[PDB]
Amino acid sequence: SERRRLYPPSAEYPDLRKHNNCMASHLTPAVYARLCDKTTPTGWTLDQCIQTGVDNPGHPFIKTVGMVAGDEETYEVFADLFDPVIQERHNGYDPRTMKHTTDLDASKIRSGYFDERYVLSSRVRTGRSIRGLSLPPACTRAERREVERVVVDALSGLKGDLAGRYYRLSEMTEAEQQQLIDDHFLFDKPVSPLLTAAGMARDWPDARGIWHNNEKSFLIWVNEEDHTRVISMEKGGNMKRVFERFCRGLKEVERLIQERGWEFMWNERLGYILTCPSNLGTGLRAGVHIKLPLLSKDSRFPKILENLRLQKRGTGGVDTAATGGVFDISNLDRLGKSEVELVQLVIDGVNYLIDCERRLERGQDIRI
Amino acid sequence: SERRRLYPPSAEYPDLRKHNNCMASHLTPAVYARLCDKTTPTGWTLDQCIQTGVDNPGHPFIKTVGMVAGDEETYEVFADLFDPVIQERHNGYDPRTMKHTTDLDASKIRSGYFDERYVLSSRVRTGRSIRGLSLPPACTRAERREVERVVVDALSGLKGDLAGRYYRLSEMTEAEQQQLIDDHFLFDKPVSPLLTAAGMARDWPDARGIWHNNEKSFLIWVNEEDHTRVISMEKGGNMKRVFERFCRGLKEVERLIQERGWEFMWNERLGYILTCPSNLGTGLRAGVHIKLPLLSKDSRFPKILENLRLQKRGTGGVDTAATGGVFDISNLDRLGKSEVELVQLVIDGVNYLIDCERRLERGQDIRI
Amino acid sequence: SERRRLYPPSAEYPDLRKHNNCMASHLTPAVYARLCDKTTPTGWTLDQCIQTGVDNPGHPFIKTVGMVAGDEETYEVFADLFDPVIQERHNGYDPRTMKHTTDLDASKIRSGYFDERYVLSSRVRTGRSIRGLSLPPACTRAERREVERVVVDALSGLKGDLAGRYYRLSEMTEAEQQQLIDDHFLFDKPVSPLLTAAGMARDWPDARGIWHNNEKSFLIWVNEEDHTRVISMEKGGNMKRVFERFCRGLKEVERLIQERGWEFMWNERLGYILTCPSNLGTGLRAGVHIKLPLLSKDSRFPKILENLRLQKRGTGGVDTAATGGVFDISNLDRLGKSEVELVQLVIDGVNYLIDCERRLERGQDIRI
Amino acid sequence: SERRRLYPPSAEYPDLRKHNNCMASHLTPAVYARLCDKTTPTGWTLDQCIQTGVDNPGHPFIKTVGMVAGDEETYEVFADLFDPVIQERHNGYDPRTMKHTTDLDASKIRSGYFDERYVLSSRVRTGRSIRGLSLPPACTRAERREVERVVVDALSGLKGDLAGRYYRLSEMTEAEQQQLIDDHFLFDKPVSPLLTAAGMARDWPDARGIWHNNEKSFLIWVNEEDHTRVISMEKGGNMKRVFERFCRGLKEVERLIQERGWEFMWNERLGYILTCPSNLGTGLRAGVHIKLPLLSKDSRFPKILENLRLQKRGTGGVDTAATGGVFDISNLDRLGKSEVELVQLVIDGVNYLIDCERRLERGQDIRI
Amino acid sequence: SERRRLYPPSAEYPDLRKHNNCMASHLTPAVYARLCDKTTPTGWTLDQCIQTGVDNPGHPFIKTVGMVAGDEETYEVFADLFDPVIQERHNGYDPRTMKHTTDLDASKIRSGYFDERYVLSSRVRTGRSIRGLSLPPACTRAERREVERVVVDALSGLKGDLAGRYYRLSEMTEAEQQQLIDDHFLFDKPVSPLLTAAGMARDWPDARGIWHNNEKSFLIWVNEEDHTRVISMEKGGNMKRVFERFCRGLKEVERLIQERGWEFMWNERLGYILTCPSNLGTGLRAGVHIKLPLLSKDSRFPKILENLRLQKRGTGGVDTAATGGVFDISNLDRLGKSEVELVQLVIDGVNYLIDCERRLERGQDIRI
Ligand SMILES: Nc1ncnc2c1ncn2[C@@H]1O[C@H](COP(=O)(O)OP(=O)(O)O)[C@@H](O)[C@H]1O
Ligand SMILES: Nc1ncnc2c1ncn2[C@@H]1O[C@H](COP(=O)(O)OP(=O)(O)O)[C@@H](O)[C@H]1O
Ligand SMILES: Nc1ncnc2c1ncn2[C@@H]1O[C@H](COP(=O)(O)OP(=O)(O)O)[C@@H](O)[C@H]1O
Ligand SMILES: Nc1ncnc2c1ncn2[C@@H]1O[C@H](COP(=O)(O)OP(=O)(O)O)[C@@H](O)[C@H]1O
Ligand SMILES: Nc1ncnc2c1ncn2[C@@H]1O[C@H](COP(=O)(O)OP(=O)(O)O)[C@@H](O)[C@H]1O
Ligand SMILES: [Mg+2]
Ligand SMILES: [Mg+2]
Ligand SMILES: [Mg+2]
Ligand SMILES: [Mg+2]
Ligand SMILES: [Mg+2]
């Protein structure tokens, strides 16, 4: 019988009276009721999007998006809720009106050479999703295996310096995995509630792997937080070389992916599509390791970082806290500016910091 | 087989040759045939809308709408029939073109203090419907229980002077109910054919209740004629205080309803959505008890009331007739003017009447 | 989205903690949950069946079925709930196993002649439903008009003594209707809550009528409580003549109905299908009027009535209470026994009562 | 287009080459392919059933079912996979052929009185699920709130000694919750991967609560691992009194649930339906706290426990490990035997153990 | 269950890394994914369109379309892929913007008379498809038989000089078929992979035939490469007479087709619809046999042919290679220019060639 009544959407509304994520602040009864009945063609629903945020109220003073996407169509189907969140996260970028430009030309960047004072090592990271396949939060076992197959077959075609091997987690010893993790060259099993609540730890470690070059200066994580996570690393300060390797490797990987008929998810409004809305746009997180001595006990570093648009997090991972005054300094925003612009911004900020690490003298200028 | 023929819509057309309600005057074969096949998403149909009017031909010289709505979508689905009725009821207000503005600021109203000559007591009343739940004419048992749960849980959060208790009719003794009714602080079982024909007496008294404050100056009827009926009362003439209490209590109730994820039905064209189209807009019925002595022997009292836009009905209820020359004087129109405007109109009219109760002298001016 | 959840059936379960009808006693959560999804092809649902019982808790010590049927298929679709009720009502008749036999031969009955002591007048009544048309609780305006048309066209073919006229309620003056009602020759507007809650007073008086013979000894009510109510009256005590007229008139009416291609609802298990399950089987209520003197002062009147299988109700209608010690004495059970058997039982019972009216002497024997 | 091909079921088959749960041992490609396309009416699928087992390979030598049910229909829809698992878990009970009998009569049990040597305290526990509502793994927010409403309203009717209060986790301070947990009178947030992977920690702590009597000897957990978890506790050894209180409280709770039209999930083959197949049947876990001295240094304690059909786990919870030689001794099997039989078995086993705690002398007999 | 996942479109993408047809060059992952799910009303799909091109990589330096159409709707449904291919084939004609004009008036053409030096014989050919019937690649047996019936019944009405007989391949001896093929008056069984991979050799020789006039100067192939192939032949050089016969015969055939209610597929953008996109527009291939002596030893013959827009292929068929320096010289483009224009172009080109066959003297001018 069709005379039976469904639960009113307001009956399903989450209790967000003590939540501290952008989803909680931007979710309203009207929006929830409007979107309560829609779904992406693959079956992704709003409740599945906001489950991670609902489960984790979020620590006060710490900003977390609290939502994930199950496929490319999500950002279009549930745009009424994602657009305010994307705008709030990326310092006012408006997906509805503005457009994103991608530029990976490593020739444009200048400077490059650093001073081995507190940089230690430099890293650049991005993420890519294969079009036509569900994202990690929603992907089935078959889709995850398909992503792994596509990526591995493509990377098999890499030649020259960017030639390496793919290691499957299921086939890797626990000691080897721990050693790789400690060396910053591997990812651990998701333990933080954000990923588990999002449903991104299902079937672990089935179809998760790491492809790395012989020099271990070019890595690709397969099915950990996104379909692919491309990392270019260097135990030095020649950020120009790291970014050049990153750009050429990414171009080769994209060419090989397109060879077999696969494409990366990408649209003009949002750029490269990923799971966490915080990673939209370019997904670039060019950064460096930074030490305590000249950076732990100066005057007003947080103001300088905010003015320079630099993020500082705890070494060893986002979940881990800073220890011994050693942090990771990267960029804040992904959507909007381009990869070259973000790398140049990071380089200028770190140059200013090593210039404004005053311990020999004083006169920190901040210089917004 | 699809070759079978349905009854022509004109076969179902009601016999309204001796009817005296706006539905009968505005229902035509073309409109009925046009709307005979449509239905709201919850299954409400035109025949269900007009059943109350069809069953009751209506006493001549007495205007009754003769229709009810089963949900919010009704006024949009069957607008072709409701819009003329709404326009006729509310002295020409056009839902299709005009817009409604709601204003409950008790600061705007002036005067307030009355003279204890015939006012005796003052009262203000409105109605509210919870969005997502069917209206009393169409609500099932589960929906009615859900409305009761939402309202009771919300009112549990009221603090301060507006703190009271919820009494369930099913748990209330017959003597207590009779005492409350005789004291004007309760509602009786619907006996008048208008409500029973509309299907608003089903499952009585299941899920019908009354929440009242300790002073019994603030009451809320749950599931009698609408989802909620909010009443602010005073055994005096300080209409300003009554309206201030009404406004603040309504604001608190709305805030608590929204806190749990529920909203009141409301749209710009019609304002607050209710069952009887006569109550659309604000649903406000600010009024006062009035005695016989000076008003009963008035020269042209009906003319003064009509010019001042004041409705006069029999004390003890709409169904009951005036006895002993004691009536209830309230406002006429709900849609269009705002709550503050209606209260000010009622206050000005009653001030004029107490000024134009001439028995000491003569010279009634009417003063349209 | 199909991921939305419906209200659990137990959420819709009626609150029957203070009900006194067979529906309340025989309705259980399991049965309700089982039957809450089914519906007859015309859309009749269980809640519609039990609404009349739910609305009216029922006076204690008074037995009311509390359910109605919206069409013929109802008794088959909701048999799980009706069968226990039918069995309880008709003193153990089992619809699932037993079968009903119809016999209207007035030749079999003997005696007939009564004594003009307390009988005053005699009456016989049955009801019939036209197959293919919804019953009064569920019939639309078109279906009711179709029933009226079929019955009127058929009755137009009656000849001989059973020749009369059809009077439409909508075309009868109030005084004429009141006079007919007072003369026990007409039906009044349904005012008792049992019929109104069942939805059998909709569109009154549209398509309700009375066809009566010139002698006013053979009447047919059209669309009051069933599609047709056939009555044979006589202001006397010659029950044999009344039953003979009843039988021949019913046979002629059935023949004329079948002539145009219409049939009466009927099946072996239940006999003639009607709205109230109490009227199933034959629907026969052969009875008489009885006075106060020798019966009001009866020694063990209820015991004799129960032993003889006779019902006593208030004169002027079931709703009206007995006044002046004058009652109506009829039979109790309809399903099971046949019409001839029922009339013979009534005749024997009235003969015994008039013989056991002892006021001249004593010695009432009851004689179960 | 319908010419597109779906992923073959074998493409979705989990990689169970290193798994140690009954699901892994009993799941085969044929069964998976057969059940890959079916679903319960509420949308529960096989992958959702086996996700918890797939995610957790299971510690070797530790037996875990590895599956959960999302509703009552699951055990019928996916019986082809659950039946072998149920049979293996409950020492050969065959759901397809055998039948379960429930008996809670506390009069049958004898003995009861214990010796305060190592018992310390006694406890009895069962679980119940409200029919018509999805189980914790699959329940939405609205369904969980409905379960809480039903249980709280029912328990409000408890009188006599079993009269207490309901405390909502969302409204309980962290210190109070920790104190209750430490006192063995509360449940903590699910942290063990078994529940989180099953999706039973969603929306925590929304709609989870604890209703306990004034003496705190009768508790009911609402929405932690099942819809309801009923516990009868005593800081002593009078197991007879504990079981009597348990039985009478459970009977009263069931009566109050049925009063409003709700039923507990229950069928003859499986008994009371719960989430973990290990808890099917009665869900009874009558047990006691046991100390180290005469049991830690036991000669062949595991053999005696296995022969007596007594399970021993770590104090403080199943996840926690035994500390200080203090364990919890309860029964092993739930389906099959009845509640009285299980309680009698536990009492006899503990009596034997306290008799066979030989430290004063030797001669442990095991006595299978 | 609808939770099963389909193969991503990129999984079905053909491997075209070594292909040399316009389909391979113009097919891209985005286009394939966009069109992977669409289909014509008769069930034709993109994979069926491109199967012939996928199977045959294509000889380098030889241009083949690599696609076929299964019905008229194909060119509209899959226009996103056909339009670039049509534009590339027909020297830049844009189907989306430009329009095609058909003109068969044989009066406009001038000259006509040729010199019997290398012409030997002249031929003109076109193709026509009956609307409402699937094209040879997709036609079933019934549709092919219907096409044969329509064409044969129409041609039966031809009178005058264009009067002949229809010969069925199934009823024709192998020796007779070979003799007809050798005389250039018949078609052989499709052996070249292009037609077989396209599915145009199914059920051979069922419903394939040849209708030829008594003089054998007017032939019509039924169901070989298209529904109808109309050929006008002459063993001479009077191209004017051949084209006049062609025009009048085509007009008569079209009139007779329309008489019975059938139409030729035709739309303004593309002209006459046929299977191979290379034949769209007019399908006209006016041409002549050409010998070796003067043309074989030509100085820059390919340049002259390209400048004059004349195609040269091997005698005996497209599959066969040129032998003895004898080729077939026809027009290149079909869509765009009209039939009269194409015939005039061919006549002018052959006149120039016979004038620029210089062996008596030198001075070839090419004269673009
Ligand atoms: N600049 C860096 N240099 C060296 N290692 C790094 C750097 N940034 C991140 N890592 C390594 O990457 C791992 C995970 O980094 P994470 O914070 O998850 O990056 P993201 O936020 O981009 O996912 C950490 O264990 C850390 O050791
Ligand atoms: N101004 C007033 N003062 C005191 N009691 C009132 C007043 N207006 C209404 N009531 C009480 O409310 C009850 C129902 O009022 P009703 O006419 O139904 O109001 P509405 O038309 O807004 O529903 C009556 O029994 C009456 O005693
Ligand atoms: N035996 C009878 N003799 C005369 N009038 C009768 C008799 N039985 C019923 N009536 C008249 O019929 C009217 C309705 O009867 P009712 O109690 O409804 O019968 P039923 O239960 O068969 O419908 C009453 O007003 C009454 O006057
Ligand atoms: N016999 C007992 N005596 C006292 N507390 C107990 C006993 N059994 C269990 N508990 C308490 O119950 C809590 C959870 O028990 P748990 O192992 O989850 O039981 P179950 O397996 O029935 O859920 C523990 O924190 C523990 O303190
Ligand atoms: N100009 C011509 N003169 C004589 N015969 C021809 C001529 N053109 C084609 N043919 C004959 O037609 C047959 C098939 O021609 P084909 O190359 O398939 O034409 P199309 O490309 O139009 O289908 C060949 O066997 C050939 O003998
Ligand atoms: Mg990370
Ligand atoms: Mg009212
Ligand atoms: Mg009656
Ligand atoms: Mg537990
Ligand atoms: Mg050819």
**Cα first-last separation, chain B:** 66
Three-state SS for A343? helix
Place of tokens 């721990």: A178
Q: What is the DSSP letter of A60?
A: T
Question: β-strand E287-290 against E271-272: which pairing, if any?
Answer: unpaired
Q: Please state the atom number of ligand 1 nearest to the C-alpha of residue A288.
A: 1
- Comparing alpha-carbon positions, the chain B residue that sits nearest to C15 is B206
Any atom of ligand 5 within 6 Å of the Cβ of E199: no
Compute the distance between CA of residue B82 and CA of residue B341 in angstroms, rounded to an integer. Answer: 25
- Which of B276, B246, B217 has its CA nearest to residue B104? B246
Q: Is A5 in Cβ contact with B132 (below 8 Å)?
A: no
Q: d(Cα A252, Cα A243) in Å, to the nearest integer?
A: 14
Closest residue by Cα to residue C75 from C269, C283, C339: C269
How close is the nearest chain D Cα to the Cα of A144, in Å? 10
Spell out the alpha helix ranges (H) of chain C.
22-26, 29-35, 46-55, 74-77, 79-89, 141-156, 174-182, 193-197, 239-259, 293-296, 301-308, 339-355
Count of beta carbons in the 10 Å neighbourhood of residue D315: 18
- Look at phi and psi of residue C223 and say left if phi exceeds 0, alpha if psi is from -120 to 50, else beta: left
3-state helix, strand, coil in chain A (%, to 5): 35, 15, 50
Q: In sequence order, what are the residues at sequence separation of 6 or more whose Cβ sits closer than 8 angstroms to the Cβ of residue B47? A: B12, C140
Q: What type of residue sits at position D199?
A: G
Counting CB pairs under 8 A, whether chains C and A reach 3 or more, is yes
Within a 13 Å sphere around the CA of B272, how many CA atoms are in the beta-carbon half? 24
Question: Is E302 in contact with E364 (CB distance < 8 Å)?
Answer: no
Query: Which token pair is C59?
Result: 């006076």
Experimental resolution (Å): 2.5
A54 contacts D13? CB cut-off 8 A:
no
Report how far residue E44's alpha carbon sits from residue E48's, in angstroms, rounded to the nearest whole number: 7
| Cβ within 8 Å, pair A15-D206 | yes
* Residue D292 and residue D357 in contact, taking contact as beta carbons nearer than 8 Å: no
Q: Which of E5, E13, E32 sits opposite A143 (nearest CB)?
A: E5
CA A176 to each of CA A230, A316, D59, D90, E109: distance values in angstroms, whole numbers, following the listed order = 21, 18, 21, 40, 85
Residue C368, CA distances (Å) to C294, C298, C358 in order: 20, 16, 17
Contact A262 E33 (CB under 8 A): no
Structural contact between residues A130 and A227, judged by C-beta atoms closer than 8 angstroms: yes
Amino acid symbol at C258: Q
Please report the DSSP string for C300-336 in residue order.
Answer: SHHHHHHHHTEEEEETT-SSSPPBTTBEEEEES--SS
**Ligand 6 centroid, distance to A193 Cα (angstroms):** 13
Helix, strand or coil for residue B201? Answer: coil
**Across-strand partners of A328?**
A289, A313
Q: Is the torsion defined by CA of D210, D213, D214, D217 positive or negative? A: negative
Buried b (16+ CB within 10 A) or exposed e, A103-132: ebebeebeebebeeebbeebbbbbbbbbbb
Q: Where are the alpha helices (H) located in D6-61, listed in sequence order?
A: 22-26, 29-35, 46-55
Query: How many CA atoms within 13 Å lie on the side-chain side of C168?
Result: 10
Contacts by residues E313-319 (CB-CB < 8 Å, ≥ 24 positions apart): E315/E289, E319/E191, E319/E192
Give, as one character, the DSSP assignment of residue E236.
S
Burial group, residue E334, by CB count within 10 angstroms (0-12, 13-18, 19+): buried
Q: Which atom of ligand 2 is nearest to the CA of B184?
A: 27
Please tell me the distance from the alpha carbon of residue A253 to that of residue C222, in angstroms, as a whole number: 85
Residues 6 or more apart whose Cβ sits within 8 Å of residue B270: B75, B86, B95, B100, B280, B281, B335
In three-state secondary structure terms, C21 is coil
* Chain A contact set for D204 (CB, 8 A): 55
Q: Which residues of A touch C5 (CB under 8 A)?
A: 6-7
Of C3, C4, C38, the CB nearest to A1: C38
What does the alpha-carbon distance between residue D273 and residue D276 come to, in Å, rounded to a whole number?
9
**What stretches of chain E adopt beta strand conformation (E)?**
122-128, 164-168, 209-213, 218-222, 228-234, 266-267, 271-272, 287-290, 310-314, 327-331
Q: What span, in angstroms and rounded, lies between the C-alpha atoms of B220 and B233? A: 11
Q: What is the CA radius of gyration of chain B?
A: 21
How many CA atoms does the CB half-sphere of A169 hold within 13 Å? Answer: 21
Please give the single-letter amino acid code of residue B43: G
The Cα of A141 is separated from the nearest Cα of chain D by a number of Å equal to 5
How many whole angstroms separate alpha carbon D314 and alpha carbon D306?
16
State how far the Cα of B179 lies from the Cα of B205, in Å rounded to an integer. 17
E269: nearest Cα among E48, E72, E29 = E72
Cis peptide bond prior to A205, omega within 30° of 0: yes
User: Using N-to-C axis directions, what is the helix angle for B141-156 and B239-259, rounded to 10°?
Assistant: 110
- Under an 8 A CB cutoff, do B143 and A5 touch? yes
CB atoms within 10 A of CB B101: 13
Name residues whose C-beta falls within 8 Å of residue D366's C-beta, 6 or more positions apart in sequence. Answer: D300, D303, D304, D307
Phi, then psi, of D221 in degrees rounded to 5: -85, 130
> How many CB atoms lie under 10 A from the CB of residue D262?
26
How determined? cryo-EM
Q: DSSP states of B207-225 as a string?
A: T-EEEEETTSSEEEEESSS
Q: Strand E218-222 relative to strand D209-213: parallel, antiparallel, unpaired?
A: unpaired
Instruction: Give the closest residue (by CA) to ligand 5 atom 16.
Output: E317
Q: What CA–CA distance (Å, rounded) separates A281 from A91? A: 13
| Ligand 2 site-directed mutation target among B114, B122, B184, B223, most atoms within 8 Å of CB | B184
Which two three-digit tokens encode residue D362? 């030797």
Which of D315, D320, D346 best tests ligand 4's pocket when mutated (most atoms within 8 Å of CB)? D315
Are E5 and A261 an interchain contact pair (Cβ–Cβ within 8 Å)?
no
Is residue E326 within 8 Å of residue E288, measured between CB atoms? no
State the alpha helices, DSSP H only, in chain B: 22-26, 29-35, 46-55, 74-77, 79-89, 141-156, 174-182, 193-197, 239-259, 293-296, 301-308, 339-355
Single out the residue of C71, C67, C70, C97 nearest to residue C82, CA to CA.
Answer: C67
Strand partners, E272: E266, E281
- Say if CB B268 and CB B99 are below 8 A apart: yes
Rounded distance between C-alpha atoms, residue B66 and residue A100, angstroms: 58
Question: In whole angstroms, how far apart are CA B163 and each of B158, B159, B211, C146, C350?
Answer: 6, 5, 10, 58, 67
Query: Subunits touching B (CB < 8 Å, at least 3 pairs)?
Result: A, C
Type of residue at D60: P
